[PDB]
């Protein structure tokens, strides 16, 4: 009941096998209008018509798994996700005719092969054919197509299609295979903004999250080689060749969690902020620099986000890794020595129980990084830190004074926001990493006469100007809860061409999103499940739309 139709001439289907395809559209997630959310369009490669149920379930699995990683998780309910059921004549492994002519080259890179059947512009199909039709028929903006992609253009072959990657934040192509491969194609000046990953490889979800890190978050491969020249140094979001810690772009993050600049290989001139990142090796999480940069990138596409508050940490303050000269050795072994030293001093998250009665007279530091997303309003955050007894009470010194401290930090405006992948940008040239960025450190001396008890821990809060708690000592290990979204007609029927997925949120989160006025041509009636704390797995939020 919901589909788009394409007209593919010889440049896109030279053998005529997909000259006029009908493509069913499935909505996996639609929590707001497409103008308010980041739109993700996923197509299938090497799935025959009878395998489209497998494709939709594969897209839901890979998507739900990608949304478990920060920074994507912080925006999980701000994406609209659509699965386009592109049918191939053959499965990918059987090797016959497929919708996207994907081949795996000698370097294990998956590519759309224009020369497989002579379709000269096959790898331009997303922005010249699928994108404009989807943006006209399905996307809430309903932008009319203005170009015929099968006729010879009189001017630029690229400029008429630049709008496609502003309405569609990302194109993803999932290949029906167990083969292990991954490929990201980002070059907006030449219309490319898609990636190719497999449905069933041993690391399928990890590959998907990594490739999405290039496409959506604008991040580079952290296994990259070479010395970055000035233009490449300024352009890169998460790589650097600056050996001086006083000048490196991410100097404010040094010593925050596992952030210690190091070479990405022996003798390498390419430096990374952490050796343990998914952008270098798919077995890891996103590093703090990738989390910050990716959060900043997505804030440009969903503009109701005001602040980034990295999860604070508490460590015993010994003086180690407290000044730039402590970060001059860039060997990978120096990164690992740094992480062992941090483990030995950690007093937060899973190491909260490492606080003991021998902490009297010792200093402790509450540290985090904050990014202001506003280019207009400066912010003031208040940090509170105290020593709390196992029975909730606040520990005191030998005179009855509580072992508590407070500090206020100013967060400057993000003045350079227009240079950081704003909506409509074709590239990234230069940006000031420190614009709107503030590393916050509260160093408190535990009194020599502190009355410490067995089971005491460090408690803390980060508060906004109105006293709202943005983060606390329970944040790092807080439970996440699974939410399921369902789409129904007024009579209770599941809306055809919907395949409602799940995402996770911090326990107690109140979802406050304005539902889209329409789902396909159905008008919104009501929603059950919003503006109420999510405190159970399998919590269902049901969106009701009126049938035609
Ligand atoms: Zn990569
Ligand atoms: Zn990283």
Author numbering: 330 to 876, 901
Question: What did the article's authors report about this structure?
Answer:
The sole known peptidase capable of cleaving both IgA1 and IgA2 is IgAse, a unique enzyme encoded by Thomasclavelia ramosa (formerly Clostridium ramosum). IgAse is a ~ 140-kDa, seven-domain, membrane-bound metallopeptidase (MP). Differential scanning fluorimetry, small-angle X-ray scattering, AI-based structural predictions, mass spectrometry, and high-resolution crystallography and cryo-electron microscopy of multidomain fragments of IgAse revealed a novel 313-residue catalytic domain (CD) from the igalysin family within the metzincin MP clan. The CD is flanked by an N-terminal globular C-type lectin-like domain and a wrapping domain (WD), followed by four all-β domains.
Recombinant production and biophysical assessment of IgA1, IgA2 and IgAse — To investigate the interplay between IgAse and IgA, we cloned a panel of seven peptidase constructs, which included the wild-type CD and the inactive E540A-variant, in which the glutamate acting as general base/acid for catalysis in most MPs (hereafter “catalytic glutamate”) was replaced with alanine. The crystals were densely packed, containing 42% solvent compared to the average 51% for protein crystals, which accounts for the high resolution of the diffraction data and the resulting Fourier maps (1.75 Å). Two search models derived from the prediction in Section 3.1 were used, corresponding to domains CD + WD (N331–N807) and Oβ (R808–N876), respectively. These calculations, which identified P21 as the correct space group, yielded a unique solution for either moiety, corresponding to a single IgAse protomer in the asymmetric unit (a.u.). The final structure encompasses IgAse residues E330–N876, plus a leucine from the C-terminal purification tag, two zinc cations, a tetraethylene glycol molecule, eight ethylene glycol molecules, and 430 solvent molecules. In addition, a formate anion, which is a metabolite of the E. coli expression host potentially taken up by IgAse during heterologous overexpression, was tentatively assigned attached to the catalytic zinc. The CD is asymmetrically divided into a larger upper subdomain (USD; E330–L546) and a smaller lower subdomain (LSD; G547–V634) by a horizontal, deep active-site cleft that traverses the entire domain and extends from the non-primed to the primed side in the standard orientation of MPs. Moreover, the third ligand in IgAse is also an aspartate (D550), resulting in a unique zinc motif (H539E540xxH543xxxG547xxD550). Consequently, the WD sandwich functions as a scaffold, positioning the two flaps as clamps that reach around and thus stabilize the CD.
